[PDB]
Amino acid sequence: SCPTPWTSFQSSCYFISTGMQSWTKSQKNCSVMGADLVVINTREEQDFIIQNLKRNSSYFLGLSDPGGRRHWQWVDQTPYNENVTFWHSGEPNNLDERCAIINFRSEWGWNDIHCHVPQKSICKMK
Amino acid sequence: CPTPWTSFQSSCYFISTGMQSWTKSQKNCSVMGADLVVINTREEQDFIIQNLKRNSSYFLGLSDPGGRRHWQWVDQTPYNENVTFWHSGEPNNLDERCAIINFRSEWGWNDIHCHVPQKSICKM
């Protein structure tokens, strides 16, 4: 028992978002409805979601890499300390963001993508 | 220290004038029973510099080996690698980067592609 267009599974209500938007905008869209981009915790959950998708479509999941700092490691395993470093002006290079989508291939699975391309999306709410 | 090497505190340093990739520079340091240089203090940086030529650029023992990205769920649910459903051969291998030390007209680190030939510094 969820709001009209939503579908229920166990503790959660699920929304399949028909519009195509960036990851951030898709997240904001779930947010106003009291939700988040979908978090998939179990195989049964994934299987439930698959039942609700169209094979001709591709959807942002609430799974991403916010980029920023690279995980610099010393070659022997000496821990890394941002204060004992001598990076030149405007250095190092930052790591680009990355977002995950789910779609149907040649079956159903996830894929990493640039965050700002528009995709459909899935909102989840307990 | 073996005569080609220079000494500082409890360590021996080797400046290697061949230009190779990071992996081979490390291989080269390793077969001498050493490693690409790991810099732990400001004073260890200062000493290494003394042994470098202003016209040269050198790999350090610092890198990002790439591999898998740091995927997070949006609500901060733990990313357990066991309940993922990535397509075969996805997600993309995150790329390797590697640090170098060189002189800008002072001394500092740049991050570059690991397969580019540079000189190197070994510490043992």
Swiss-Prot record, chain B:
Q: How does the record say this protein sits in the membrane?
A: Single-pass type II membrane protein
Q: Which GO terms describe its cellular component?
A: external side of plasma membrane; ficolin-1-rich granule membrane; plasma membrane; secretory granule membrane; tertiary granule membrane
Q: What does the UniProt entry list as the effect of changing residue 116 to A?
A: Significantly impairs carbohydrate binding for the trisaccharide Gal(beta1-3/4)GlcNAc(beta1-2)Man
Binding of Ca(2+) occurs at 90, 92, 96, 110-111
Question: Which domain of life does the UniProt lineage start with?
Answer: Eukaryota
| Effect after changing residue 104 to A | Significantly impairs carbohydrate binding for the trisaccharide Gal(beta1-3/4)GlcNAc(beta1-2)Man
A GO biological process held by the record: antifungal innate immune response
Which tissues is it found in, per the record?
Answer: Expressed in plasmacytoid dendritic cells (PDCs). Constitutively expressed in immature monocyte-derived dendritic cells (iMDDC) and is significantly down-regulated upon maturation with LPS but not with TNF-alpha.
Q: Which residues form the C-type lectin domain?
A: 8-123
Q: Which residues are glycosylated?
A: 28, 55, 82
Question: Altering residue 102 to A: what's the impact?
Answer: Abolishes carbohydrate binding for the trisaccharide Gal(beta1-3/4)GlcNAc(beta1-2)Man
Cellular localization per UniProt: Cell membrane
Q: Which residues bind a carbohydrate?
A: 57, 96, 102-104, 110-111, 118
Q: Tell me a Gene Ontology molecular-function term this record carries.
A: metal ion binding
Give the primary localization class.
Answer: membrane
Provide the alphabetized UniProt keywords: Adaptive immunity, Calcium, Cell membrane, Disulfide bond, Glycoprotein, Immunity, Innate immunity, Lectin, Membrane, Metal-binding, Signal-anchor, Transmembrane, Transmembrane helix
Q: Which residues lie on this side of the membrane: Extracellular?
A: 1-124
Describe the effect of residue 118 to A. Significantly impairs carbohydrate binding for the trisaccharide Gal(beta1-3/4)GlcNAc(beta1-2)Man
Can you list the disulfide-bonded cysteine pairs?
Answer: 1-12, 29-122, 98-114
Its function, per the record, reads: Lectin-type cell surface receptor which may play a role in antigen capturing by dendritic cells. Specifically recognizes non-sialylated galactose-terminated biantennary glycans containing the trisaccharide epitope Gal(beta1-3/4)GlcNAc(beta1-2)Man. Binds to serum IgG. Efficiently targets ligand into antigen-processing and peptide-loading compartments for presentation to T-cells. May mediate potent inhibition of induction of IFN-alpha/beta expression in plasmacytoid dendritic cells. May act as a signaling receptor that activates protein-tyrosine kinases and mobilizes intracellular calcium.
- Subunit note: Homodimer.
Question: In its UniProt entry, what is this protein called?
Answer: C-type lectin domain family 4 member C
